[PDB]
Amino acid sequence: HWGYGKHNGPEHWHKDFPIAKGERQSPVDIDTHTAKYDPSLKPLSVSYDQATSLRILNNGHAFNVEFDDSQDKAVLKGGPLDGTYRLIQFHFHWGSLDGQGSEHTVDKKKYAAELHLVHWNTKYGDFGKAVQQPDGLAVLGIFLKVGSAKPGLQKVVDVLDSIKTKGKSADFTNFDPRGLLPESLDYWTYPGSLTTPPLLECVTWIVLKEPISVSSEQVLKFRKLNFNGEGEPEELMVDNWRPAQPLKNRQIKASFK
Ligand SMILES: NS(=O)(=O)c1ccc(SCCc2ccccc2)cc1
Ligand SMILES: [Zn+2]
Numbered sequence: 209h210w211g212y213g214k215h216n217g218p219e220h221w222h223k224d225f226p227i228a229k230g231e232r233q234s235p236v237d238i239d240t241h242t243a244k245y246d247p248s249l250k251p252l253s254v255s256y257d258q259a260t261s262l263r264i265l266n267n268g269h270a271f272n273v274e275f276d277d278s279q280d281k282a283v284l285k286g287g288p289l290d291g292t293y294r295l296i297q298f299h300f301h302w303g304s305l306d307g308q309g310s311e312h313t314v315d316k317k318k319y320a321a322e323l324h325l326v327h328w329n330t331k332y333g334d335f336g337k338a339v340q341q342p343d344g345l346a347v348l349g350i351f352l353k354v355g356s357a358k359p360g361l362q363k364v365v366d367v368l369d370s371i372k373t374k375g376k377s378a379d380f381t382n383f384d385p386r387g388l389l390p391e392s393l394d395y396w397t398y399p400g401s402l403t404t405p406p407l408l409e410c411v412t413w414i415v416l417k418e419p420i421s422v423s424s425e426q427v428l429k430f431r432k433l434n435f436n437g438e439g440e441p442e443e444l445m446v447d448n449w450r451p452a453q454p455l456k457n458r459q460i461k462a463s464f465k
Contacts, residue, residue, distance in 0.1 A: 234311070
């Protein structure tokens with residue numbers, strides 16, 4: 209029953225998920241003047257050439273592009289991370305309007321949407337065990353702004369008709385998530401949480417400084433999705449973002465000067 213309406217939205221989640229008011233919740237505002245350059249952070253290593261996408265699913269709160277994570281085919285390493293993190297899925301959060309939609313903000317600026325590439329620490333064996341560990345997940349966050357189209361997103365846009373409603377899935381093989389990356393891998397990093405229930409505090413967040421641009425037609429297609437199931441009253445899947453949470457006792461580090 210959690211969701212993003214007036215009656216079950218982010219301000220309600222604490223009643224089922226008390227960790228909502230915890231010590232390391234996400235997203236946060238990234239105050240660019242207070243994040244500290246940390247010259248000891250390494251370059252991020254994104255190794256996606258062997259990625260195997262399988263399926264795309266509307267789960268009633270976003271859509272997930274899911275990957276085969278039973279071997280080291282698409283991994284994230286380096287940066288703030290120790291060890292190897294396997295890509296399991298990516299999804300997006302977006303707005304009803306171009307002026308909102310991202311979860312992280314940068315000096316209080318909201319982007320039109322935010323992509324999360326979700327990875328789990330292979331020393332924990334599987335995703336379900338990894339979410340129980342403080343260093344269990346690494347999520348790569350990438351901001352979307354509206355402008356020129358992103359060619360490598362179009363295959364995702366074009367399948368959304370087939371997963372309009374909650375519970376719908378479609379084969380989605382041979383999708384290359386390298387086509388969703390910006391040029392620069394400059395990033396901010398901080399310890400945080402899943403941004404949907406169960407809000408577990410298991411995520412090293414790596415948020416890229418450079419946004420990707422997508423076309424107005426691309427984001428319009430996200431906004432045609434439905435939160436509801438087929439044969440239920442239509443509620444457009446829009447504004448599926450949690451707002452910024454208190455930073456509390458955390459420092460955001462920057463990979464760049
Ligand atoms: N928006 S986010 O990137 O922070 C994010 C990533 C992954 C999940 S998965 C649901 C949590 C879960 C699923 C299955 C077993 C245990 C926990 C939720 C939110
Ligand atoms: Zn997310």
